[PDB]
């Protein structure tokens, strides 16, 4: 049928618990569950599940007027008490959400009326509405689907209020979404969406060529990039490559030898030929990243000094730092210890593996011995949180997490960042200023705090920025131009109009 589409994703969508993370896929969570306010391209929010709201004079107590015509997909009603139960179920696992400051800010959530929801905060927290608009965790499953009054330990059926329903899910094969015919808002033209679980990038390309796939949508790992370029030349196909949405880099571990020496981290930053890396691994399709955030990110246009490819400088830095070449070897030594660094990455990811090989070859030219450790995704995430890495692939999160939610998350073991920053003398100051950037209502103070935080991180060579990556689309021409969602982790299926 024309109003049905088939697409692909490398893994199943997961249980679609609205209040957990791995292995739930964010775009899928955003198809089924909804927020109180909805994020916009211009950077604002609009009323969503909340029709309107008011706030106390001190800005700590917020009262939302919800919509009254909203039902979960199973018929049960969405009301303040339902909302209140969700927030409660979230905050029971508050430590897990500590990366997002709103989770540490909510003091109390009370259902006043059927339509009146009251939230109480520790402070007049300015990112309040924006953080409510995020995919997760502050979105709403039917309280009837809790397991023993909790969500943190699992849910029953993923029942939400969103315009899509998870109808069927088969492990390593497919997930199927049907339009929710009792959705409170405008109805999507598409009635059915079938996600074929196809882990391999090359297989995803082949599947598209068969005619069986209407739409591929995702980041730079979606298809091999030489194939995508080929596809873009094909008048029978449609392709798109958005403007950059986020940074891909290495996180260097400042608390683990030898990446604990500033001079090693700087030397590493000088050793990699990023342009050559990008041309070769990314097929010239992306741009070179010099800083944790691109200068187009709010608050990040700071004129930070780029590290250019300079192996001469790199080897000079190392020499001064006492890392010398012993007779008969090409790897440097300091106190009888070889300059070994462990680079961990997801072994099944083609792009990471390819970049890692390039990077390893680059560092060998400065006398650094990089060992590649490709592992399962879960093992990689585990190393990110406990700090068991020398260098680790890492990326930023896109709008609207960048930069504020991403900096916030640095303060706890969330992704790699906290652990990578442990060895820095000024780490406690950085964490303090991050807190202050989230607290201040003065733009001028916020500009300064961002400059100070981002400048330290840059000058202390915590990261090795590689590239700024894009979204890509491959589609049948009959679907027309495919739009992008304001939240980079969401896919705007509800906006696709078949013929
Ligand atoms: N935040 C997730 C990791 C993740 C992958 N993609 C998005 N987030 C976790 O720690 O479980
Ligand atoms: N750690 C948060 C934020 C994030 C956005 N993208 C990846 N992570 C989450 O996974 O929900
Ligand atoms: Ni995450």
From Swiss-Prot:
Output the Gene Ontology cellular-component terms: ATP-binding cassette (ABC) transporter complex, substrate-binding subunit-containing; membrane; outer membrane-bounded periplasmic space; periplasmic space
Q: Which UniProt keywords apply?
A: Nickel, Periplasm, Signal, Transport
Q: Where is this protein localized, as stated in its record?
A: Periplasm
InterPro entries in the record: CntA-like, Peptide/Ni-bd, SBP_5, SBP_5_CS, SBP_5_dom
Gene Ontology MF annotations: heme binding; metal cluster binding; nickel cation binding; peptide transmembrane transporter activity; transition metal ion binding
What parts of the sequence cross the membrane? none
Instruction: Name the Pfam families for this protein.
Output: SBP_bac_5
Q: Which PROSITE patterns match?
A: SBP_BACTERIAL_5 (PS01040)
Any single biological process term in GO: nickel cation transport
> Would you say which domain of life the source belongs to?
Bacteria
Q: Which family does it belong to?
A: Belongs to the bacterial solute-binding protein 5 family.
Q: What does this protein do?
A: Involved in a nickel transport system, probably represents the nickel binder.
PANTHER family recorded: NICKEL-BINDING PERIPLASMIC PROTEIN, PERIPLASMIC BINDING COMPONENT OF ABC TRANSPORTER
Which named protein is this? Nickel-binding periplasmic protein
User: Encoded by which gene?
Assistant: nikA
